[PDB]
Design a protein around this ligand. Sequence first.
Ligand code: MN
Lengths: 471, 273
Amino acid sequence: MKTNTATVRCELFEEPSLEFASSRLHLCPKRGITIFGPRSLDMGKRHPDIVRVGFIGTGETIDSATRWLESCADGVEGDVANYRFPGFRADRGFFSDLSFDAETVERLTLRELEALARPRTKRERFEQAVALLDDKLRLLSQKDRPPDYVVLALPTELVKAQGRVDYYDKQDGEVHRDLRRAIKASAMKYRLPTQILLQRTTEATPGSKDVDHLSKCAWNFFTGLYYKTGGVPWIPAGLSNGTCYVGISFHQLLGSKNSGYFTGLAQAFDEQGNGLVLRGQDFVWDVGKHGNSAHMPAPIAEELVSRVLKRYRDELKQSPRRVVIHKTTEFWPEERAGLQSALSGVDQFDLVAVRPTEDIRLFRDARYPILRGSHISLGDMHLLYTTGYISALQAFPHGHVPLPLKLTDHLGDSSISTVLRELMVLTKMNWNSANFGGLLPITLRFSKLVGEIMKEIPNSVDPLPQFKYYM
Amino acid sequence: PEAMVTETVYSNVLPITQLPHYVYSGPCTVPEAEVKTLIKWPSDKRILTPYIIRGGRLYAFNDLKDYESPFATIVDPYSAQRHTLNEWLDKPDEMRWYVELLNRTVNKITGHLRLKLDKEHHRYFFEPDEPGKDKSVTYQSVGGVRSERKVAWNPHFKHNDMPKRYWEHLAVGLRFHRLGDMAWGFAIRPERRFTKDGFESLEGKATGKKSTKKKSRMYNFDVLKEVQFWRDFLSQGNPRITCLFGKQALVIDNSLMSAAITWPEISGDQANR
DNA sequence: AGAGCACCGCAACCAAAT
RNA sequence: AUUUGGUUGCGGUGCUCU
Ligand SMILES: [Mn+2]
């Protein structure tokens, strides 16, 4: 049986531009803030002119983080492989000023760090750790002028012992709890965007491994600090005017005996001239919904996209023109009917299912990897390179070989090239870091971040739809 | 973006130019912990005998329908139905039995090559023939040039010292893919398996460090050489990875699926094709 | 209580990238 | 947990059979 050989057809996608200050387009997020500035610099009074910063560190870590933020916000030089940091003062870089008030500084005293050794097991010890870290977020949230930003400079001995606690809890089985997911959820009920800053970053010596060069440690910290205090660093240019990008991702229940997979939402839409806004998961799924398989059933499919359109007709006041549901898993026929019967109020839809692949990986005979933006089609398999060598910077700022992003499933009114053009510009919107691009789109990266924190929310607390609290 | 240069890219999959197209069912079978009296090892040793026992059958490729069969003259005398690939292609359950027979087929192909299977991560790793000694294999390329690579080496420490007390066995991640209605692919994934002193694996945490320390500086020229080395090891010359069953053939054409893409050029590389 | 394929989640350590 | 890329290990789910 002479099998028909697969035809390998290929094309490359042009790199999108991001709208920086004065609506000036530039490719790299690092270089577009140095020349022009952040996007919200002239957009109005949304630009944070003064940022008030609090600390929940101990005595040594607060001083180390303060001298790091004073020797890091005034310009950091970089080599040829790391573009320099301009600064975070009122005349350099982001054109915003850091201000360390001494009234908004909590402090982990030594009588309390040793109070979390008295409980016997590992459950109550971690619970008391989350208890005082919640209490000293409360004491900052109840001041008459709460800080705009809270930097938890956690000590090393607390993170080493209570940062990752796994135990057995009778009816739940092996339970793994994390400190970071338990204090970004306690800072969300008090409305305080926080930033955990360990001693490996603030005390890092030059020419030392396991951390970046100080230019990238400046960039990835202060881009997140600029977004978390209000204002937007950059917005893309080549995107539609009515799309309602949804980023559904599945997540296990908390425990090794509870079998089930709940969902995580991420709306990514456009509000007037402000650019992309990232909303998601105003609610918590009821404990009786679940879903035995990895995918989702039909009443959940009808409720979920109904709440998606409810979020769209509350901030844009219109029905969405397009709804593009990115998802990690494939589309079963149970959930394909329910994302289509309940999308009858929307003109066009695009049920898209992407996932990085395992063994198939294109290579090149040169010394540098195959580029970012390729669209290799091995017959029916479609492989998109959201990571690779980038022609704008002429460098590969990663290691090993990039994984392809396999398009596992597609059904909708758009083509394959059109939605894989929109996916590559949705890739570049990770405001957590000042990197050029990542693997997954921000719809599937924010909703791997919201469902991991929904595992550490005590039910009655309603979660907040911002990208600030989940970053 | 100053000029467009056409390059040729190389994937890590091998096309399957010929497939077994008759799955001869065996619907009378003594269960799995008896099957050793297949006997009947052919005069042509090029014939391979895969088999599975699913639902009281003996699904195989060895032409079990007639009397003189290479497989199971006692277990399945003449009862067969000759199920085809064409009627099975629309059934998701029966395109799983076929690719599992193909997985056992390539497992039996890598038996003369002496690649041991881990049977847990689908990993065919080398091991040395004699304990305490290194294994370095000599292979013939497609173009005729003969080379030799260490595959079970124990690295001596760089500062003129004792060896680093972990053996770096070189492994492969073969898998089968459907690339069309009838287009197929054979994917090669290079890997490493790290042992203590040979023949005894490392733990779950130290292997994660020792594979990340090695496969982080293995950029897009020292992974392509491993893929080329693996197609040359599975080739052993005669550039078609072939397998015979008796009036059926599984022939893997060992040329990596190439293409041609036009992009703005990269300074300093200038790939020499 | 197992075998097999196909496809997913998530937890540890690395390394700053030719 | 400044950050992303990738590796490794563990487990889960769907389907079929014993
Ligand atoms: Mn962050």
